[PDB]
């Protein structure tokens, strides 16, 4: 039958916060999301710091150089 | 009990609207924090050798 199909054990791959199969995940869910989405946000902040500097440097080359500012 | 990271999720970045406001403001602060720190680290690494260290000398 198709009722012979049970889902294999993911206890190896699971997080610690959802291992107890007698426990409602909802209390941990917000923490589990908050952890992963923090990584993403921290990455975006770190790139945003870089991107700002890279762009600003190219913009500054297009601006007035040292030798023109000197003899102005 | 509301946890550490869940408390961030719940109020700070559940919505994608506030997600960005957090990133922007966090990046605004991070820039000041990191630059200042890494400047000071580089300046302590290279103590006395840069102009700002020997500027009082000739001024």
């Amino acid at each position: 039958s198709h009722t012979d199909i049970k889902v294999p054990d993911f206890s190896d791959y699971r997080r610690p916060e959802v291992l107890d199969s007698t426990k409602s995940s909802k209390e941990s869910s917000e923490a589990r999301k908050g952890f992963s989405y923090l990584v993403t946000a921290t990455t975006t902040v770190g790139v945003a710091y870089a991107a700002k500097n890279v762009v600003s440097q190219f913009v500054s080359s297009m601006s007035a150089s040292a030798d023109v500012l000197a003899m102005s | 009990a509301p946890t550490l990271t869940a408390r961030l999720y719940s109020l700070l970045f559940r919505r994608t609207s506030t997600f960005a406001l957090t990133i922007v403001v966090g990046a605004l602060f991070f820039e000041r924090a990191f630059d200042q720190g890494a400047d000071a680290i580089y300046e302590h690494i290279n103590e006395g050798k840069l102009w700002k260290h020997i500027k009082h000398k000739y001024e």
Binding site: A48, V55, S56 | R15, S17, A20, L21, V24, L28
Partner: peptide, 22 residues
């Protein structure tokens, strides 16, 4: 109706941005 707090929050997100690079 419902996009007023969202568009205000995105209005803030965009605003600080122009402060972000400049």
């Amino acid at each position: 109706r419902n996009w007023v707090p969202t568009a205000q929050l995105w209005g803030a997100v965009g605003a600080v941005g122009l402060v972000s690079a400049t």
